[PDB]
Amino acid sequence: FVAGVINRERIPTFERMLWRVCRGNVFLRQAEIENPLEDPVTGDYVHKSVFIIFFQGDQLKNRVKKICEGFRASLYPC
Amino acid sequence: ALSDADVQKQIKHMMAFIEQEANEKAEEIDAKAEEEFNIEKGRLVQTQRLKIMEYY
Amino acid sequence: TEFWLISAPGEKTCQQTWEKLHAATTKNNNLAVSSKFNIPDLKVGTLDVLVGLSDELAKLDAFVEGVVKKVAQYMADVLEDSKDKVQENLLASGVDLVTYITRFQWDMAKYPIKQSLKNISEIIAKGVTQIDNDLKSRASAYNNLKGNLQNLERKNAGSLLTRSLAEIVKKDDFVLDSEYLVTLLVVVPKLNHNDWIKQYETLAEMVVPRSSNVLSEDQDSYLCNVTLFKKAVDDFRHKARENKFIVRDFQYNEEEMRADKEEMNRLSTDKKKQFGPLVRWLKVNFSEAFIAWIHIKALRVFVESVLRYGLPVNFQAMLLQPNKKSVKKLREVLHELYKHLDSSAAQQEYYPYVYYKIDC
Q1: Does the beta-carbon distance from B2 to C345 stay under 8 Å?
Q2: How many angstroms away from the CA of A40 is the closest CA of chain B?
Q3: In this structure, are residues C15 and C337 in contact, taking their beta carbons and an 8 Å threshold?
Q4: The domain containing residue C95 runs over which residues?
Q5: Which of B37, C3, C153, C283 matches a 20 to 30 Å C-alpha distance to C12?
Q6: Considering only residues 15 to 34 of chain B, which have any Cβ-Cβ distance to chain C shorter than 8 Å?
């Protein structure tokens, strides 16, 4: 599963909004970054605490892709 | 979600969904395989029978 | 007919049964109506497919909802032995909404119990598409009848300047088959009856005074025929215009009069003959569309229940008729019963239970 890196400002709703895409459908991946670099968009350094939903299915992966990208989240790696 | 109880349950459920689809798909694959076995075998056999007919 | 259809996690069927059937457990302290809902057991091979279907189902839901509202409107529209407040709803398969629902079952008539989910959705969609087009054609026929009928009402309506004279002019009074004498129709205010008769004389040369005679009266004016030499009619009508008088260019036509009477009777007869069978056809379309609607809701129920719980799939659900002003409490009770069962993290964002609205 691919966890993203967020500025952690809205991980509350990131996670809940992803839950509701298909709730409980995939396991939550928790990733954290301590002593981070400045976020590229805001140039701000802030630890990351991210709850990610990753799906195997293509329709739902596409769905969560859309949801997570609408949210200010970076999903760069695979 | 946040609670380990909930995420663990969600995982059990997902795996269950994954397993159910996997299980059904494998049986489906073997059934079609058997159907094709009989179909293809007959196709080739009849083709040969006609060839033998011509030798006859 | 507003009912909520609620999906339960179903951990224990006997338990869910207790919490849904028992008087001590009936929602809103046993004042709300609570009926159990069941569907045949069905399996879906892929949940991601189920998800797609879920979106599709919601779209179909909207489609058929549109379809049935259209239907409601067309029945309402005919008003044949009916009114807006009388027989507003029709029975489905001969029973009422709650009766239908409680007696609702997945209909092999709608789809094979072994039919694919995709295929089920397809059957429903094709059906209602078929219904929609039926509605389109029959509604066209209805509107065409209504339009021409009003057009006819207008023809036999209005003032004597423009109204048809089929009921007014008699063959003995209209000057028929005269080569040289043409009859013009003039409408004179009653207060000016005698004046325009005199005025006519002054409209053209060789216009015989006092030949103007009233054939029938209107509310504001009398309609009179005037006989004059054909050549002078151009002068007659022109000077009439100069005197603010409208001369009607009218010819007796026996065939047209009969033709209009025939259309009058023809259109009324076709109207009646059409509405009888029109509404019977529409009634069948209605019953079929409602049955389908419930079918759709139940499928959504399948999809949703699987999506929340997966396997095993015994599905428990309730069809509830809320009591007035107690829906908050009803929700609260269901929340208390299922919230801790739905998730530890915590409607559309999260839902203790899955429900959909019925309103017909």
Answers
A1: yes
A2: 28
A3: no
A4: 39-161+252-312
A5: C3
A6: 16-17, 20-21, 24-25
